[PDB]
Amino acid sequence: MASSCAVQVKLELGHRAQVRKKPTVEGFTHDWMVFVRGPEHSNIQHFVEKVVFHLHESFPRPKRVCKDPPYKVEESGYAGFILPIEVYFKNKEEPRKVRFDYDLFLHLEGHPPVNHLRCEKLTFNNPTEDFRRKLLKA
């Protein structure tokens, strides 16, 4: 210092939400899938250790943890909600994780299905060269 490396990576969070043909046994109206992915083609597997989806409390095992791609959870439900997502890096220093509060929103019946994409830029300031090597392999 004063010198600085600023490594930037791109992340993509999104979800699909369809109405089923007919509700489940529990009368679940919708089918949805939410994901965390890199842009084409990437492979965030190099620097991402695990992704943690925090579903609503009304779900069994609401804390879903994907430590291998694809980073996604497939579920059926009746309503939308705010879904905290935590991305952990293969990193020994701060930040060791980043948190996004994803709006997994549903559309009403007699309306088009949901296909939402949310792009996020991550900036790591002066990372170690090992973590940088991981970030650059993506």
């Binding site: 609503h56 009746y78 309503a79 939308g80 909600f81 705010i82 929103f105 549903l106 559309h107």
Partner: peptide, 5 residues
């Protein structure tokens, strides 16, 4: 649109 909130 229903949200649990």
């Amino acid at each position: 649109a229903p949200r649990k909130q």
